Amino acid sequence: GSRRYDSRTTIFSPEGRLYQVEYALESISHAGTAIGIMASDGIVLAAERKVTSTLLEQDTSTEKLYKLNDKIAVAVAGLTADAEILINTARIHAQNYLKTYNEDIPVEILVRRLSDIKQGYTQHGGLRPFGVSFIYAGYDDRYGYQLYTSNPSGNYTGWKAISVGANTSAAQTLLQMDYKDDMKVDDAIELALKTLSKTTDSSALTYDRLEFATIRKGANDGEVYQKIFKPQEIKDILVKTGIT
């Protein structure tokens, strides 16, 4: 019957590797680079828009930075379609936690759930895994600013600075070179743009090819603020940092 056409997406290799997870990663490696840098007073998310054009509308566009919560956001690397499916279930999960406990969902709790969903497509179902890798940037009163990462496998880890997508090896090296524990948000913001600027496959790192977001505790308040930069805001920050 059907057995003949079954790819068997959930099996071990003789080495004990998960073919599809490996291949999914292989796919991610060709996606626009996304970087997450965590500072003492905030977190930074930066991503390079893959495929752009004169005609591509950018004010309306979003393909790498999605707001999950009021204190959580993710940077995407891979299949946007696949990412949205997961993103929406994540937004729902956060709201449920809120309804059940009357408290905003702790960042890691949201990340473990999403990672679990992925992990599933790895052990049963005969379906393909999601070709997506997320960089999570969020804040809660138990661990303050946190930066996480999850991929097709369903595994996640915490980071001070991390990149996903293309040229991660290069990007990782450069971050490992200039990241310092005592960094400040604006410091991180610059390190971020610089790294991309150095790994970019393009000629110049123009604003029309970037998406930017920061989670800073607006001092004049006492609460945390999520901000996804608009085309012009990215264009500005791009000049100041010295990339014009």
Q: Which of residues 212-231 bind another protein (CB under 8 A)?
A: none
Exactly one of 112, 194, 217, 227 binds another protein (CB under 8 A); which one? 112
Instruction: Return the axis-axis angle of helices 185-199 and 231-240, rounded to nearest 10°.
Output: 90
Complex with another protein: residue 19 or 225, whichever CB lies closer = 19
Q: How far apart, in whole angstroms, are the C-alpha atoms of residue 76 and residue 35?
A: 10
Complex with another protein: residue 146 or 214, whichever CB lies closer = 146
Residue 113 lies near another protein (rule: CB under 8 A)? no
Size of the site for another protein (CB under 8 A): 87
Exactly one of 1, 219, 220, 222 binds another protein (CB under 8 A); which one? 1
Q: How far apart, in whole angstroms, are the C-alpha atoms of residue 36 and residue 175?
A: 10
Sketch the per residue contact string, 88 through 107, with another protein: x for CB under 8 A, - otherwise.
-----------xxxxx--x-
Q: Are 235 and 243 in contact (CB under 8 A)?
A: no
Complex with another protein: residue 148 or 212, whichever CB lies closer = 148
Q: How far apart, in whole angstroms, are the C-alpha atoms of residue 138 and residue 123?
A: 29
Exactly one of 40, 92, 95, 125 binds another protein (CB under 8 A); which one? 125
Q: What is the CA radius of gyration of the chain?
A: 18
Residue 238, amino acid: L
Question: Which residues in 37-76 contact another protein (CB under 8 A)?
Answer: 38, 53-58, 60-61, 63
Residue 8 lies near another protein (rule: CB under 8 A)? yes
Reading the block at residue 173, the tokens are 């090296």
Tell me the closest approach of the beta carbon of residue 240 to another protein, in angstroms: 26
If we measure between CA atoms, which residue out of 43, 95, 104, 96 comes closest to residue 74?
43
Number of neighbouring beta carbons within 10 Å of residue 55: 5
Residue 6 lies near another protein (rule: CB under 8 A)? yes
